[PDB]
Design an enzyme around this catalytic site. Sequence first.
Site, PDB file in Angstrom:
ATOM      1  N   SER A  43      17.687 -69.078 -51.023  1.00 41.08           N
ATOM      2  CA  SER A  43      18.468 -68.403 -51.575  1.00 41.08           C
ATOM      3  C   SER A  43      20.203 -68.635 -50.817  1.00 41.08           C
ATOM      4  O   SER A  43      20.879 -68.047 -51.331  1.00 41.08           O
ATOM      5  CB  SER A  43      18.146 -66.770 -51.349  1.00 41.08           C
ATOM      6  OG  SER A  43      17.055 -66.513 -52.159  1.00 41.08           O
ATOM      7  N   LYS A  99      22.299 -69.219 -53.827  1.00 41.13           N
ATOM      8  CA  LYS A  99      22.921 -68.068 -54.577  1.00 41.13           C
ATOM      9  C   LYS A  99      24.463 -68.299 -54.199  1.00 41.13           C
ATOM     10  O   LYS A  99      25.379 -67.614 -55.183  1.00 41.13           O
ATOM     11  CB  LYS A  99      22.358 -66.892 -54.254  1.00 41.13           C
ATOM     12  CG  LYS A  99      21.178 -66.547 -54.648  1.00 41.13           C
ATOM     13  CD  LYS A  99      20.662 -64.942 -54.046  1.00 41.13           C
ATOM     14  CE  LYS A  99      18.975 -64.874 -54.699  1.00 41.13           C
ATOM     15  NZ  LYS A  99      18.044 -65.442 -54.147  1.00 41.13           N
ATOM     16  N   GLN A 154      11.105 -60.555 -57.464  1.00 39.11           N
ATOM     17  CA  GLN A 154      10.988 -61.595 -58.104  1.00 39.11           C
ATOM     18  C   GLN A 154      10.326 -61.276 -59.587  1.00 39.11           C
ATOM     19  O   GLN A 154      10.260 -59.856 -59.847  1.00 39.11           O
ATOM     20  CB  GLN A 154       9.500 -62.435 -57.655  1.00 39.11           C
ATOM     21  CG  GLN A 154       9.780 -62.662 -56.045  1.00 39.11           C
ATOM     22  CD  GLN A 154      10.724 -63.726 -55.707  1.00 39.11           C
ATOM     23  OE1 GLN A 154      11.093 -64.208 -56.606  1.00 39.11           O
ATOM     24  NE2 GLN A 154      10.888 -63.724 -54.404  1.00 39.11           N
ATOM     25  N   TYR A 181      18.044 -56.388 -53.967  1.00 42.96           N
ATOM     26  CA  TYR A 181      18.134 -57.984 -53.821  1.00 42.96           C
ATOM     27  C   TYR A 181      17.065 -58.404 -54.797  1.00 42.96           C
ATOM     28  O   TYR A 181      15.968 -58.177 -54.861  1.00 42.96           O
ATOM     29  CB  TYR A 181      17.874 -58.244 -52.600  1.00 42.96           C
ATOM     30  CG  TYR A 181      18.231 -59.851 -52.244  1.00 42.96           C
ATOM     31  CD1 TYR A 181      19.400 -60.382 -52.186  1.00 42.96           C
ATOM     32  CD2 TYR A 181      16.901 -60.615 -51.982  1.00 42.96           C
ATOM     33  CE1 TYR A 181      19.536 -61.626 -51.952  1.00 42.96           C
ATOM     34  CE2 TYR A 181      17.009 -62.105 -51.821  1.00 42.96           C
ATOM     35  CZ  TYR A 181      18.493 -62.408 -51.690  1.00 42.96           C
ATOM     36  OH  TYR A 181      18.646 -63.834 -51.376  1.00 42.96           O
ATOM     37  N   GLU A 230      27.848 -62.205 -48.583  1.00 47.26           N
ATOM     38  CA  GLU A 230      27.477 -60.877 -48.014  1.00 47.26           C
ATOM     39  C   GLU A 230      28.430 -60.946 -46.751  1.00 47.26           C
ATOM     40  O   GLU A 230      28.335 -62.121 -45.836  1.00 47.26           O
ATOM     41  CB  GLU A 230      26.109 -60.483 -47.568  1.00 47.26           C
ATOM     42  CG  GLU A 230      25.263 -60.617 -48.768  1.00 47.26           C
ATOM     43  CD  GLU A 230      23.945 -60.374 -48.714  1.00 47.26           C
ATOM     44  OE1 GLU A 230      23.621 -60.019 -47.372  1.00 47.26           O
ATOM     45  OE2 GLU A 230      22.946 -60.797 -49.384  1.00 47.26           O
ATOM     46  N   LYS A 261      24.762 -65.909 -45.576  1.00 45.85           N
ATOM     47  CA  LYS A 261      23.667 -65.932 -46.565  1.00 45.85           C
ATOM     48  C   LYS A 261      22.635 -66.416 -45.786  1.00 45.85           C
ATOM     49  O   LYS A 261      22.639 -67.545 -45.259  1.00 45.85           O
ATOM     50  CB  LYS A 261      24.026 -66.434 -47.602  1.00 45.85           C
ATOM     51  CG  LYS A 261      22.889 -66.484 -48.928  1.00 45.85           C
ATOM     52  CD  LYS A 261      23.089 -64.977 -49.300  1.00 45.85           C
ATOM     53  CE  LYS A 261      21.886 -64.700 -50.180  1.00 45.85           C
ATOM     54  NZ  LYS A 261      20.567 -64.435 -49.461  1.00 45.85           N
ATOM     55  N   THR A 262      21.461 -65.699 -45.823  1.00 48.38           N
ATOM     56  CA  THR A 262      20.041 -66.308 -45.421  1.00 48.38           C
ATOM     57  C   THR A 262      19.496 -66.944 -46.442  1.00 48.38           C
ATOM     58  O   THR A 262      19.729 -66.604 -47.705  1.00 48.38           O
ATOM     59  CB  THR A 262      19.209 -65.183 -44.796  1.00 48.38           C
ATOM     60  OG1 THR A 262      19.056 -64.440 -46.115  1.00 48.38           O
ATOM     61  CG2 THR A 262      19.813 -64.764 -43.637  1.00 48.38           C
ATOM     62  N   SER A 318      15.477 -69.066 -47.715  1.00 50.13           N
ATOM     63  CA  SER A 318      14.186 -69.642 -47.388  1.00 50.13           C
ATOM     64  C   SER A 318      13.287 -70.211 -48.629  1.00 50.13           C
ATOM     65  O   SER A 318      13.524 -69.727 -49.495  1.00 50.13           O
ATOM     66  CB  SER A 318      13.223 -68.712 -46.650  1.00 50.13           C
ATOM     67  OG  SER A 318      14.062 -67.754 -45.442  1.00 50.13           O
ATOM     68  N   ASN A 349       9.781 -71.701 -42.616  1.00 52.85           N
ATOM     69  CA  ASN A 349      10.347 -70.539 -42.787  1.00 52.85           C
ATOM     70  C   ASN A 349      10.028 -69.689 -41.643  1.00 52.85           C
ATOM     71  O   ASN A 349       9.009 -68.925 -41.690  1.00 52.85           O
ATOM     72  CB  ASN A 349       9.754 -69.998 -44.098  1.00 52.85           C
ATOM     73  CG  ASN A 349      10.160 -68.772 -44.382  1.00 52.85           C
ATOM     74  OD1 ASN A 349      10.810 -68.120 -43.728  1.00 52.85           O
ATOM     75  ND2 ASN A 349       9.674 -68.004 -45.374  1.00 52.85           N
TER      76      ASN A 349
END
Length: 356
Positions: free
Chosen positions: A59, A62, A115, A145, A266, A309-310, A312, A337
Site C-alpha cells: 500500500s 497508494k 478488501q 481504510y 498520512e 505510508k505503510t 505490505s 511482512n
Amino acid sequence: APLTATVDGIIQPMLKAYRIPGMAVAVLKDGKAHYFNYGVANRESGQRVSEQTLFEIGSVSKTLTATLGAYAAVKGGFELDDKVSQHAPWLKGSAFDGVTMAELATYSAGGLPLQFPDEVDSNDKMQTYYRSWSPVYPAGTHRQYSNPSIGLFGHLAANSLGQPFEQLMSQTLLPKLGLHHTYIQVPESAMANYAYGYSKEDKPIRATPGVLAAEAYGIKTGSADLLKFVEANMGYQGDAALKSAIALTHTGFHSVGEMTQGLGWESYDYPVTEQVLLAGNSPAVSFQANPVTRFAVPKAMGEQRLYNKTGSTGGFGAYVAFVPARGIAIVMLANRNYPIEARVKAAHAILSQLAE
Ligand SMILES: [Zn+2]
Ligand SMILES: [Zn+2]
Ligand SMILES: [Zn+2]
Ligand SMILES: [Zn+2]
C-alpha cells in the site's frame, strides 16, 4: 560515524528478531541520498540486496496512485469535490451519486470495506458490487481504510484522461517523476532484480494479482527510486502540473486523532512522538471505521509535518516517512511482512537522529 552506525544499530537487531532475509534502507539528509543494504533478495540463490533490488511496496503504492489521481485533477479530468458518478456513468443512481472523488480517495465514502468481498474478483462483478453497495455511514463522516475505495479513485481518475490506469502510470506519471526502475508489471528484463517475499512459513512468495490491485498495492520498486519519489515530495521543480499534483497530495481532508489524511500520504504535526506515530499507524486506525474530525475546507498541510505510508504484501513489508521542513526522509523496504510497530519504531529512531 553516527550515520552508518546509527542505521546499522537500529536495523540489524530488527532483522534478526523478525528473521528478515533482506532489507533496503535509504535516507535523505542535507540534500543527499544514503543507501544501507542488508541481507539477501533471494534466499535460494543468495543474491544480495542493493538499492536497485525490486521489492513489493504494498500500500505505499497508494501514494503514487494518489499522485496520479491528483495529476488527472490538475489536468482537468475531474474536480475533487465532484460526485463520483459524474465520472462513472455506470454508477449513476447508486450511492456514489452522493460521494465525492475526494471522499473516495481518503477512505471516507461511508464504510467501503478493507478488501473486496472474495468473489468480487472480476470487472463485471466489481461494477455490480459498487452499483449495489449500501453505505454504512454518511459520506465524509467516517474513515475506513479501504482498497476498494482508493482503488476506484485511481481507476476513475485514469479514465478521466482516457487511459487505463497502468498505461497512465507507466507511460506518463513514472517517467515524469524520473522513476525508470519502478513497475506495476515487472518486465522480463528487470526480473533478475525482483526479490522474493517470504511467508511466515519461510516459503518464497510474490503478490496475488486481482481487481484494482495495481491501484491499491501494485508497485514494485527499489529504495533508490522510492527515495527519488520522496525527494519530489520534499521540493519538486519543472513540470508545473506535476508540481501541482504533488502539492495536492499534501492537502489534508480530515483527521483521525493526530493523523491527517491526505491523498495517499498520512501526516502528523512535527515534531511527533513515537507513541503518536505508532497510534496513528495502529489497527485502531487502520482496521476499523473511525469518525473523522471534519475540516471546513481542505487545507495545505505544509512543510513542518511528518508524512508517511505503510505498505505490505504477503511476503513484503515497507515504510516511508519524510519531514520536508528538516530535509530528512527514510525508506525501508523488506522481503518479510513484519510488524508495522517495529517499522515505525526503527524509522522514528533514525529520523530523530537525522534531525541532529
Ligand atoms: Zn552517503
Ligand atoms: Zn471468482
Ligand atoms: Zn472502468
Ligand atoms: Zn522510463
